[PDB]
Amino acid sequence: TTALVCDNGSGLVKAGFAGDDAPRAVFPSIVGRPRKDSYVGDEAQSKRGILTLKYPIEHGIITNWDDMEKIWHHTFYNELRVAPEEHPTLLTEAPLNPKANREKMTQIMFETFNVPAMYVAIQAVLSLYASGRTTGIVLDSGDGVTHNVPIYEGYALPHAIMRLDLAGRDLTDYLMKILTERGYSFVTTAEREIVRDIKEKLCYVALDFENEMATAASSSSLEKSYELPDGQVITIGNERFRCPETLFQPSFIGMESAGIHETTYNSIMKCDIDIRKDLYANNVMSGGTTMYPGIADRMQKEITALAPSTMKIKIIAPPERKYSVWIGGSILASLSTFQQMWITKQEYDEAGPS
Amino acid sequence: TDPAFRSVPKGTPCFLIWRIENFQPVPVPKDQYGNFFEGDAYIILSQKDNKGILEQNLHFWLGKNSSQDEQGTAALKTVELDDYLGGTPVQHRECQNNESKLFLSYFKNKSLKYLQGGVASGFNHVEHIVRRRLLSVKGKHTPRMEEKPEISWSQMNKGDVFILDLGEIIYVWNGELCSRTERIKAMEIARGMRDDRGTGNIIVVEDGEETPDDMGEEEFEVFNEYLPVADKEASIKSAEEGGADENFEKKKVAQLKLWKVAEEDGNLKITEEATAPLDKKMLDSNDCFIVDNGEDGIWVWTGKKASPKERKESMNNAMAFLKQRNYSSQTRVTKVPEGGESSEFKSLFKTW
Ligand SMILES: Nc1ncnc2c1ncn2[C@@H]1O[C@H](COP(=O)(O)OP(=O)(O)OP(=O)(O)O)[C@@H](O)[C@H]1O
Ligand SMILES: [Ca+2]
Ligand SMILES: [Ca+2]
Ligand SMILES: [Ca+2]
Ligand SMILES: [Ca+2]
Ligand SMILES: [Ca+2]
């Protein structure tokens, strides 16, 4: 039997089969109900006008259990097209997910889809394994949440975990705003998807923000073109690096939190002194919001200025890191000990969700 | 517990080396210690009894060409072996040409050698290949769809409607002598495909109106890249050369046949349940059913309450049909879970 790996993200669902090197289903974590009682994923976005669209997962924590049922139903029966009662299923959970939340995932998975067995793994931990590591600090940034998870010998240190409510959906909103100030028109949710595409294709992180800001202010050498679905071409200037700069300067979006370089530093400082050298040398980045060109060299620069000079700072940016969590779960569910660590339907029916 | 870790002495000194092979730590022969393949990942456990205490060092060595699944398995298994021995071992990550002195101390006499190659990755490469196919919609009463063995004009005619399926972009090509029922049924087949995949734009193309003006500059490029307009007249067949719409539909209704795979008293039986018009209520959730559309697709409907022997033998006999009838490579067997029936599967049922 081959197992299923479903990485329930805040904005995207990454699902597939254990043993594969990449997910076969990447669709938005969207449920659309009309103003065919439900629409999930891309079809819900292709029919925005008829429906109201809601996020079942908020900041990594799943909040609408009824609409999330439709996500998992669409995942099994529409995307993968598999009988869930035939496949063990590995799910992912956000760092510091409440226990009662993990219990309700198990309940739905067993007495709604009748899976034979299941297991829940932490998203940041799976990314570290995917990079071939058991010790390190993971920076996981997606659509709704950004975390700093220091992990030592295969287990996260929960006392030093940082949570930043600044992520990709906030960055997409910021790009809509500054492009509207420029003179363009992007306010609707349908235009949110246009700007999200602009963000993923033309944005990057400047190694020196004020110098890059001075470059774009004196010439047009940094300006790029973007073709709208209409065919109109628009010009993107300093907005290309002002949008990702919010990660390092949260005050751009109106947030007095520390930057992702400081939260990474503050997380390491909350761990024992005799493991920080390994934590500095193993900064593993994960998620789509970490896919900006130049974010690795900027993180390398900003952390080197905060850390002691005798410490070696190393940032690891795997090429396929927007799927690190899923790839990490694919290896775990392919190990012949996934059978030993999972909970079977009979054990759950007997003992319970505990 | 992994059966390759059970023989690890939990109190006495030892020195063991495992090699990751297809998601599994395979123990290395003792005399081969030090021979490391660059394409593989290893796990090295050293236990010495230094002055009455057991110092346990747990290293996983990563070759410079090791695959991602082997590096993750080595990391995952190192934690598993760490917790099995109480958690007291100390984990070290060792990369090729950058190993620690403690790791190299184990092999000073044994001679450390880096070897080329290694065992194949256990990953299955997902290529994300889009299924591009030329579909044919022909019929009078209710047009039936057929996948052509190629994408060209020599596979088409001027009397039917054809669907150029390209995944995200779908072309519906109307022949100038095509029926009115073929024009609407092709849209249902196409709109059902777009709703099954959740996205996609459908383009309606008329015969002779394939001009970048009344079609689209970028729309024409994709159409011409797969269906060149210049090779049309020599290759496209006449509406008369295409057979009778009635004879085509009669052929497709006859090839439909519904099999039933049920357990009964523990002895599995595969009877012929029905033919002709097929209805949704024929499919019972307590059993498995094989929908035989012949060379145009074998569909295994799997009910929720079906037995494991029903599910296994239903796929086996559906696969057996393909090899026995020596169908072409394009004839596929598709497991259809109850509640995950696609529009193409429902098209085989007249009432639903
Ligand atoms: N090339 C890119 N450049 C910048 N951002 C990108 C790129 N590709 C994807 N993203 C962003 O990554 C986000 C989704 O990534 P991911 O699937 O890791 O997040 P998620 O798991 O849905 O969210 P969370 O991590 O909060 O659960 C989207 O907001 C998208 O805008
Ligand atoms: Ca995530
Ligand atoms: Ca190998
Ligand atoms: Ca340990
Ligand atoms: Ca016809
Ligand atoms: Ca039965």
Numbering used by the authors:
A (entry chain B): 5 to 39, 50 to 368
B (entry chain A): 2 to 353
Q: What do the paper's sentences say?
A:
Villin is an actin filament nucleating, severing, capping and bundling protein; however, the structural basis for villin’s functions and the characteristics of the actin polymerization nucleus remain poorly understood. Villin is a member of the calcium-regulated gelsolin family of actin filament severing and capping proteins, a class of proteins found in Asgard archaea and nearly all eukaryotes. Eukaryotic G domains are often associated with a ~65-residue C-terminal α-helical headpiece (HP) domain, indicating that this architecture was likely present in the last eukaryotic common ancestor. In vitro, villin can nucleate actin polymerization and bundle filaments.
Thus, the actin conformations bound to the separated halves of villin have relaxed toward the twisted G-actin conformation by 8.7° and 2.2° relative to VA3 complex subunits A3 and A2, respectively. (G and H) Comparison of actin A3 (slate blue) with the G-actin structure from the V1V3/actin complex (orange, RMSD of 1.4 Å for 351 residues).
